[PDB]
Design a protein around this ligand. Structure first.
Ligand SMILES: CC(=O)N[C@H]1[C@@H](OP(=O)(O)OP(=O)(O)OC[C@H]2O[C@@H](n3ccc(=O)[nH]c3=O)[C@H](O)[C@@H]2O)O[C@H](CO)[C@@H](O)[C@@H]1O
Ligand SMILES: CC(=O)N[C@H]1[C@@H](OP(=O)(O)OP(=O)(O)OC[C@H]2O[C@@H](n3ccc(=O)[nH]c3=O)[C@H](O)[C@@H]2O)O[C@H](CO)[C@@H](O)[C@@H]1O
Ligand SMILES: CC(=O)N[C@H]1[C@@H](OP(=O)(O)OP(=O)(O)OC[C@H]2O[C@@H](n3ccc(=O)[nH]c3=O)[C@H](O)[C@@H]2O)O[C@H](CO)[C@@H](O)[C@@H]1O
Ligand SMILES: CC(=O)N[C@H]1[C@@H](OP(=O)(O)OP(=O)(O)OC[C@H]2O[C@@H](n3ccc(=O)[nH]c3=O)[C@H](O)[C@@H]2O)O[C@H](CO)[C@@H](O)[C@@H]1O
Ligand SMILES: N[C@H](CO)[C@@H](O)[C@H](O)[C@H](O)COP(=O)(O)O
Ligand SMILES: N[C@H](CO)[C@@H](O)[C@H](O)[C@H](O)COP(=O)(O)O
Ligand SMILES: N[C@H](CO)[C@@H](O)[C@H](O)[C@H](O)COP(=O)(O)O
Ligand SMILES: N[C@H](CO)[C@@H](O)[C@H](O)[C@H](O)COP(=O)(O)O
Ligand code: NA
Ligand code: NA
Ligand code: NA
Ligand code: NA
Lengths: 348, 340, 352, 338
């Protein structure tokens, strides 16, 4: 019933999200159990630091979850792009836990980075979609995300499923803390509602098809503004637009520069801003204002009922702050898909 | 005899680079001595990790020197933008060494980041230009970079002076290792020549003026391609272009996925850089290539502009590579009638 | 009504044990709150390792609680004798948490070790009885143990109060762990019973007095056998006998050597063995059997009701209430304090 | 050979076993230590939260004798555990611990149980073992075979001094990248070069020690050994030897912290508290046996003079008269030490 595998995969997300969590979360007692990590957790905690290493959209899923790992675990977490990690010859030692995120489990730069960490004595952990792929075999332990196959060239359901797996991994690491208990529960109860909220967000597709037809198809570039939890989503949205739609795009840290890209925008170029409550910073408001003043008409992704400015609005349900990126990425997936098909591009 | 403070400050770099090292490097014996830090070095090293925290060009100087800190010290080093560091409520603890880089020592997010780290019991180190500014006073210890006052609106000499001070800090932290003695000597001997090499690089100004006179100056954006040590230079070039020239620009990790400037000096001449360049020459895209004197990155059968710079030690190459970008950003602004 | 400050201080222990815990343990909700440390706990935890540093009986209170600190916190814990720490010039750094235990807060070697750690940038924590003493002032934070003044020359109540404060510190450090909750609850409920159990143990005095009036008073040496939690108690018992009774004494790790001191002892050499359930190891039973095999007549400190040596073999028992394993040392040391005291009295020594 | 007992042979063999332990491993001219068993593991061993040395009996003493030099040269926390007590406390161990197991036999039950405990917990394990291919040798990740040759006497003698040498070489190897350590490294390496000949010289104290053991010293019930600092381990090991071989009670005491008396008063460990303890003894006219450096007048007493070596190597020489005293006290008391 679907034009492309990509469209099918986007629409499959309530199912792929549920299947990633299946058998792993007791939503009643609020307990997370990851069979592949279970016996390794005590060891994983006992590291100097966690280094998340990935390429492309998997690198984004790491940026999207870095804050929650830091918050729940109080272990240092850094996020490396695999190729740049190898280019710097970054030192790795026995006391590092290196977490490798990959949909295919076969990306050359990820495998090379893995081999480098393995040779240095680090503990290695895979978060991988292709069961028994090279990355799954070669990591010491890990989690198969169970999202099913992706045929679309750009990753959609693997991003949301990876992000969920990474959240479950952070919850697992912090499952012995009294002080964390209430935050754990909050997140777990939030995760329970994600698949249905994704169903809801997918109902934006008509408004999105209209927006592309009326304001976007014709455009050479588009700028995405985000901060905090939503900066990763701005980078991922930009990558989707670039890969699928063959249009220029850039994710920008909102309001970081006064005199930067926004002091230098046309009253014409399309701008999408993340203004959901989890990442509604004064710098995001100033960025939006600097657009409206200039007579740009921003596209605002925000939570249902919110009045961000006096523009096009795409409303999404409100979830737990660290989960909001799971909902906010979906309209960007749909935008990139429709922009591409409306240009005769094959997305499969 | 300069039109603007920015032009004066760019041309001051052989002197500011020299002044940053003055009294701190024994070039004969290859000994670095940072008075502000030396009784603190054993404690700085005894940390779980180093967090470099800064904004803007100062954040770039951190990115430009991260690899040499990690290489020489084998201490984990992460680099944070002060505002994003705060947005995440990044936990920090007694075992962190937090290194704050700031020309002014007054930038609001850098200050708030500092106070946050201090409240959490971290050791704090300032790399600061304004002596006795907030950041200078409130950090436990530090190095004044001694670049002199910087009055241009965009940072030029403070970037190259911050980068030098950071390399001296990394050398200081690693001064007890026999295995890294040769690498220390290499870098220190390389640093001695940087001021005279900056003088050489400033000799590109005429070629750069000729470039900024061309229809380059009516472009809406400029892309900069770099990788490894030169990725920070690409990000900093793009900031200068946006800040000064009012032209859009983006620094791109070369080959990871309209005028184009590509960094192709030997320190950062990766296969991915070459393939990115080839992609541009395949569509006869006429790239501007920053490369080392005498290296033909692109054949004569493709139109391209070359800006040759001296070869230095790999982790010092960014000190020279940033200079043409400073000059391009300045002359683009002048050609566009911008009072820099 | 007491003959000496030392006697009074021994018999004051139900009250001092209570006083150390007072206002710090919610026994109903099982919460420990140490005001002196509360806001420093997250920082104390964030260390490479804990170094306990002390002299004499205060050093023994560290040995007596090392295992529970290790168990509850999973942070490396080492215990140093202050003078030896200084002799080795042991390297200390910013990532070390240094814990100084001292009754007086004025012992020279403890103060020198503190200054050494302070100047090296380590976090320092005092567990001190004398309020506002040098160690109390100079440590970053700490717990005043609240045992009251100790006038006896040998430490009695400050030992049990230090030991309790250290257990409370260990509980405070591990109070965020779900997996530790049952162990915390077990220990805290145990602590609540310690003051009344100390009172029970003190009822042993008549038996001990009779024993000190025995063939025991005549001999020149006494060996103590202990393992595990009770090794510290053997060392502290030997120190008390040496310091107070002026008799030679040695605390011996039980059954460690098959042909060590026990293969050499005279039939009539006085030997005290700790055989309470918390430290009743096969090696302890081995050592005890080696003693009785040679016709030795050991004194057995064991839990109420337990038969460690057959009634067929001559031996003395001093029975003590059973408590939580890591708290048993609080009860087991009491008879040694009383033995050292009555051995001294009977030899004319003035213990004050 | 011309020796009455294996134990006597093995004592007198120490110049040779000390040399053999070092052979092929120390370049004395260039001051370079190379331990083949460790070469590829050193960078990893250094990257640990801490080092735990774990051993029994005399091997536990060799850890105490070298703890200080490990701490000094490496700035890694070093703790020393008796294997049985380590197990008794169920002391936690983790991935980030380097656990160093010292054993002559490589077969001691508590040492093997402690090794398996550490292995299951994911610690890096390092063996310092005399019997090649023994349980401890095979099952540690990496290690150094001490090359002392077979030891048949039941009190360890040559295995103590060879374990102690092996451990010092291990400490030197861990700190071989430090510029600030270089002078100290060279001092200790030049010191080690002279140890075998210095042990030859100390063995010439034998007649003086026989004279001492012919006296009423052999009729005593207890012998107290006083030491501090580097020489505390020596005092413990001396006491163990007297108990194991001589069947006389002995205790190693930390000098001046609180009957024949031996006091270690060599310059490496000549603390105020040692001098105080010695004065206490002479004040009551107790007649101490003093082990001190050649030419030193420490203070009726007996003096056993030993050559001066580097502070952290002095234990290697000081232990030798204790081994001889234990052996001749046994012979005088009619005990077959074999
Ligand atoms: C492969 C397999 O039989 N998985 C079963 C396992 O799933 P479970 O979810 O427990 O484990 P995973 O499928 O995630 O992992 C399988 C194994 O692969 C390792 N691993 C995984 C990913 C990675 O990147 N690297 C890596 O080493 C894990 O540590 C584990 O040993 O128990 C479930 C019942 O609860 C079953 O329904 C699953 O079919
Ligand atoms: C400011 C000052 O009087 N500097 C003097 C210092 O230079 P020197 O180069 O030794 O020291 P710096 O100027 O770098 O540092 C001055 C002091 O400020 C501290 N600090 C510095 C920067 C920072 O961000 N945070 C921070 O805490 C340093 O730890 C130091 O205590 O000794 C020289 C003599 O050898 C004199 O010529 C300089 O005039
Ligand atoms: C001595 C004192 O005023 N104690 C008061 C403190 O008891 P509380 O039990 O809260 O505190 P302690 O007496 O244990 O500690 C007093 C102070 O001294 C510090 N410290 C203590 C011991 C040490 O060795 N080193 C050290 O630095 C502590 O960190 C603290 O700042 O607050 C209570 C209010 O609830 C009062 O009833 C107590 O009278
Ligand atoms: C046993 C062996 O083959 N030794 C050879 C090795 O000596 P070399 O001195 O190089 O090595 P060792 O004999 O010390 O150790 C041999 C191996 O056993 C390991 N190990 C050792 C002790 C221990 O307790 N645990 C442990 O795992 C080492 O890591 C190494 O892999 O090369 C020399 C030539 O260069 C040969 O003369 C020796 O015959
Ligand atoms: N086109 C996709 C992104 O949607 C690619 O960029 C991948 O994300 C990138 O190659 C990493 O792939 P991986 O997740 O299989 O390791
Ligand atoms: N305009 C400059 C860039 O050249 C700014 O981005 C500064 O670099 C940034 O504000 C940081 O300032 P600082 O170095 O004084 O803390
Ligand atoms: N005589 C007593 C023991 O009872 C002494 O050993 C002290 O315990 C020792 O001096 C330590 O004193 P302190 O706890 O005041 O620091
Ligand atoms: N009798 C000897 C000591 O002289 C024993 O104490 C051993 O030292 C002890 O059994 C350890 O043996 P090991 O070094 O073979 O592991
Ligand atoms: Na695997
Ligand atoms: Na300062
Ligand atoms: Na204090
Ligand atoms: Na082995």
């Amino acid at each position: 019933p679907y034009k492309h595998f990509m469209q099918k995969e986007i629409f499959e997300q309530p199912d792929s999200a549920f299947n990633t969590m299946r058998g792993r979360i007791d939503f009643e007692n609020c307990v997370v159990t990851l069979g592949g990590l279970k016996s390794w957790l005590s060891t994983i905690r006992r590291c100097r630091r966690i280094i998340m290493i990935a390429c492309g959209t998997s690198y984004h899923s790491c940026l999207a979850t870095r804050s929650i790992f830091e918050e729940l675990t109080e272990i240092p977490v850094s996020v490396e792009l695999a190729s740049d990690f190898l280019d710097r010859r970054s030192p790795v030692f026995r006391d590092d836990t290196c977490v490798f995120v990959s949909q295919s489990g076969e990306t050359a730069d990820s495998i090379l980075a893995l081999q480098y960490c393995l040779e240095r004595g680090a503990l290695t952990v895979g978060i991988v979609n292709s069961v028994g792929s090279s990355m799954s075999r070669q990591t010491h332990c890990g989690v198969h995300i169970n999202a099913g196959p992706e045929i679309g060239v750009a990753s959609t359901k693997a991003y949301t499923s990876q992000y969920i797996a990474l959240v479950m991994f952070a919850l697992s690491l912090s499952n012995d803390s009294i002080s964390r208990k209430g935050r754990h529960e909050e997140i777990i109860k939030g995760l329970q509602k994600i698949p249905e909220q994704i169903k809801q967000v997918l109902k934006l597709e008509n408004k999105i098809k209209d927006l592309c037809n009326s304001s976007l198809n014709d455009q050479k570039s588009l700028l995405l503004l985000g901060r905090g939890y939503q900066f990763a989503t701005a980078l991922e949205g930009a990558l989707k637009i670039k890969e699928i739609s063959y249009m220029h795009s850039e994710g920008v840290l909102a309001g970081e520069l006064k005199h930067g890209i926004l002091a230098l925008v046309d009253e014409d170029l399309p701008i999408i801003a993340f203004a959901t409550r989890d990442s509604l910073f004064p710098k995001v408001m100033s960025a939006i204002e600097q657009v409206t003043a200039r007579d740009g008409r921003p596209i605002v992704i925000c939570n249902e009922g919110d009045a961000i400015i006096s523009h096009t609005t795409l409303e999404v349900p409100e979830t737990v702050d660290c989960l909001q990126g799971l909902l906010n990425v979906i309209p960007l997936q749909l935008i990139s898909y429709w922009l591409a098909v409306n240009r005769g591009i094959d997305v499969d």
